[PDB]
Amino acid sequence: MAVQIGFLLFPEVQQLDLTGPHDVLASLPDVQVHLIWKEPGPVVASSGLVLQATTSFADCPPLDVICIPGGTGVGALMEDPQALAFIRQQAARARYVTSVCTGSLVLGAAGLLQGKRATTHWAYHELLAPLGAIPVHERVVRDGNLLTGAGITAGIDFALTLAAELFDAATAQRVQLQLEYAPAPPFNAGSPDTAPASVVQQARQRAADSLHKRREITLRAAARLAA
Amino acid sequence: SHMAVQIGFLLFPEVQQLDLTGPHDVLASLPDVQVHLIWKEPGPVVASSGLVLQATTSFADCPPLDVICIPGGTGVGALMEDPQALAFIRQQAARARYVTSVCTGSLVLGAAGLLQGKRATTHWAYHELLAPLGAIPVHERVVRDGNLLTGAGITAGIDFALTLAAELFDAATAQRVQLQLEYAPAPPFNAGSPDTAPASVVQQARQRAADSLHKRREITLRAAARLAA
């Protein structure tokens, strides 16, 4: 009867995609939160922060909510049939199937974005359409029981949205206040629409190799869904 | 590299993990930083939510830090009376380029004597505990006094870390990180501050925190008495 919430924890995850939502959701009554990988034990994030998976795929209970974070490690997952099959297995009955940042590309590779409205990190957004999504430029996009969040820090806004769906608005407001989540960002560069052009150019320049490699992975993943 | 900026977070039992992990991912995005997670010994440390983190170094083996950062959480009460942790913080604060904290981590800075006559904030529910530790209490989300930079409650760590990034490097660098992370929060409710949340919500929350506040007040006054002697 506790709400079962599971995050996929994988090598080279962008840890804040997971740890933001985790601290939001673990604050709720009558929840149990799982960090899932192929086996329990240490899993190193892209920053070198060490996290700890609490369960294997086999021991994970049926989930009410599955959440796929993003990060450098998603390219491997997009071509990992075990991970994709596990995600499909839990998605079907899960009440909610959510990702954050490039975690939606993993949902896409699993075939779970076909004909659905979805978002991802702004630098990767062109990869949603080949995976069958209708790409929406909004920070949290809901299509039925699919909730996708945009890039990294969007996980906090996504998790508060999810909290209200699982419980109610009052419960989400309580958590928002405990987290003192009234952001006053010291710059206005969080989107390509508002950042200085020089900043956008440098960020695009840095993401370019990753985007090309992910363009190739995405097109192999899509072809597998078609065949 | 061997010339990296050395950034250290104190990692203690019953930490509020987001206070640490938010800033960590922002600062680890900067060029040629090394980040340490410091406790009495390396090994696992369990956050208040049950998330397990891993300390990378002991107090004794930690190199001199450019930045020290103290997170908050339920475990701060013990830290405020832990002579070994307080001595480590004071030693590192003697030479650090920035001494910071997030959430109730400033109460630990206060117990270490580092807030006396300095502007600072802390989690809104414990904010009246700054003044007995000698601080000038400021109701702002990131407060700066010289090389002391404190963040307010939990998620303020992200705003804090971007502010610190601009000081360590420059504004263009902190803007790039803000964009690479796509950090543009758009909360679905407006309850992040006691001034804006529905009154019933602020009242529920104060009802909840009261026991903790009365316990932390007594720890705070013991810590203050040790600074006065």
Judged by a CB distance cut-off of 8 A, whether residue A199 touches chain B is yes
A89-120: burial string, b at 16+ Cβ within 10 Å, e else: ebbeebebbbbbbbbbbbbbbbbbbeebbbbb
DSSP, collapsed to helix, strand or coil, labels residue A52 as strand
Helix (H) or strand (E) holding A4: strand A3-8
Q: Write out residues 21-60 of B within 8 Å (CB-CB) of A.
A: 21-22, 24-25, 28-29, 35, 37, 44, 49-54
Chain centroid to CA A82: 18
> Which amino acid is located at B164 in the chain?
L
In which residue are the tokens 């190199």 written?
B63
**Residues in contact with A73: Cβ distance below 8 Å, sequence separation at least 6, in sequence order:** A10, A11, A12, A13, A46
Q: Is the dihedral of CA B203, B207, B209, B215 positive or negative?
A: positive
Pairing of strands B33-39, B5-10: parallel
CB neighbourhood size of B182 (10 A): 22
If we measure between CA atoms, which residue out of B135, B12, B24 comes closest to residue B75? B12
- The DSSP secondary structure of A181-220, one letter per residue, reads -----SSS-SSTTTS-HHHHHHHHHHHHHHHHHHHHHHHH
Do the Cβ atoms of B17 and A14 come within 8 Å?
A: no
If we measure between CA atoms, which residue out of B108, B138, B127 comes closest to residue B15? B108
Chain centroid to CA B133: 16
Q: In the numeric block, which tokens belong to residue A170? A: 């009052």
If we measure between CA atoms, which residue out of A200, A103, A141 comes closest to residue B176? A200
Catalytic residue among A8, A51, A101, A154: A101
Q: In the numeric block, which tokens belong to residue B99? A: 């001494």
Find the closest chain A residue to B124 by CA distance: A180
> Which amino acid is located at A179 in the chain?
L
Q: Is the dihedral of CA A174, A175, A176, A180 positive or negative?
A: positive
Q: Write out residues 97-156 of A within 8 Å (CB-CB) of B.
A: 101, 121-123, 139-140, 150-154, 156
CA of A194 to nearest chain B CA: how many angstroms apart?
Answer: 10
Q: In the numeric block, which tokens belong to residue A213? A: 């490699």
How far is the C-alpha of A96 from the C-alpha of A98, rounded, in Å?
A: 6
Helix (H) or strand (E) holding A51: strand A50-53
CATH code: domain of residue A76: 3.40.50.880
Q: Supply the DSSP symbol for A10.
A: -
Q: In the numeric block, which tokens belong to residue B204? A: 């529920």
Cβ contacts of B18 on chain A, cutoff 8 Å: 19-20, 23, 179
Pairing of strands B52-55, B43-46: antiparallel
**Residues in contact with A5: Cβ distance below 8 Å, sequence separation at least 6, in sequence order:** A25, A31, A32, A33, A34, A63, A64, A65, A67
Round the CA-based radius of gyration of chain A to a whole number and report it.
Answer: 17
HSE-CB for B18 with a 13 A CA cutoff: 30
C-alpha distances out from residue B134 to B95, B156, B180, B212, B228, Å? 22, 23, 39, 21, 10
Q: Counting Cβ atoms within 10 Å, is residue B1 exposed (0-12), middle (13-18) or buried (19+)?
A: exposed
How far is the C-alpha of A171 from the C-alpha of A187, rounded, in Å?
A: 30
Q: In the numeric block, which tokens belong to residue A107? A: 């949902």
C-alpha distances out from residue A160 to A20, A133, B72, Å? 10, 24, 21
Count structural domains, chain A: 1
If we measure between CA atoms, which residue out of A55, A45, A44 comes closest to residue A5? A55
Judged by a CB distance cut-off of 8 A, whether residue A195 touches chain B is yes
3-state secondary structure chain B: CCCCEEEEEECCCCCCHHHHHHHHHHHCCCCCEEEEEEECCCEEEECCCCCEEEECEECCCCCCCCEEEECCCCCHHHHCCCHHHHHHHHHHHCCCCEEEECCCHHHHHHHCCCCCCCEECCCHHHHHHCHHHCCEECCCCEEEECCEEEECCCCHHHHHHHHHHHHHCCHHHHHHHHHHCCCCCCCCCCCCCCCCCCHHHHHHHHHHHHHHHHHHHHHHHHHHHHHHC
Q: Counting Cβ atoms within 10 Å, is residue A38 exposed (0-12), middle (13-18) or buried (19+)?
A: middle
If we measure between CA atoms, which residue out of A205, A216, A226 comes closest to residue A75? A216
How far is the C-alpha of B144 from the C-alpha of B195, rounded, in Å?
A: 22
Establish whether B62 is a catalytic residue. no
Do the Cβ atoms of A179 and B153 come within 8 Å?
A: yes
How far is the C-alpha of A72 from the C-alpha of A88, rounded, in Å?
A: 21
CA of A168 to nearest chain B CA: how many angstroms apart?
Answer: 12
Rounded-to-10 torsion of CA A42, A43, A44, A49: -60
Structural domain of A146? 1-227
How far is the C-alpha of B185 from the C-alpha of B196, rounded, in Å?
A: 17
Yes or no: say if B179 and A189 are a contact pair by the CB < 8 Å rule. Answer: yes
How far is the C-alpha of A59 from the C-alpha of A39, rounded, in Å?
A: 9
How far is the C-alpha of A155 from the C-alpha of A16, rounded, in Å?
A: 8
How far is the C-alpha of A87 from the C-alpha of A85, rounded, in Å?
A: 5
Quote the Cα angle for A195-B20-B173, to 5°: 25
Judged by a CB distance cut-off of 8 A, whether residue B80 touches chain A is no
What experiment produced this structure?
Answer: X-ray
**Residues in contact with B130: Cβ distance below 8 Å, sequence separation at least 6, in sequence order:** B106, B107, B110, B115, B120, B121, B122, B136, B137
If we measure between CA atoms, which residue out of A20, A54, A5, A43 comes closest to residue B50? A54
Cβ-based contacts under 8 A for chains A and B: 216
Nearest neighbour of A196 by CB, restricted to B16, B175, B191: B175
Yes or no: say if B152 and B127 are a contact pair by the CB < 8 Å rule. Answer: no
C-alpha distances out from residue A210 to A204, A213, A222, B100, Å? 10, 5, 18, 34
Length of chain B: 229
Cβ contacts of B204 on chain A, cutoff 8 Å: 174
Do the Cβ atoms of A164 and B188 come within 8 Å?
A: yes
The resolution in angstroms reads 1.3
**Residues in contact with A201: Cβ distance below 8 Å, sequence separation at least 6, in sequence order:** none
Nearest neighbour of A185 by CB, restricted to B162, B171, B194: B162
- Name which of B183, B201, B207, B213 to mutate to probe chain A: the one with the most chain A Cβ atoms within 10 A of its Cβ: B183
HSE-CB for A82 with a 13 A CA cutoff: 10
Round the CA-based radius of gyration of chain B to a whole number and report it.
Answer: 17
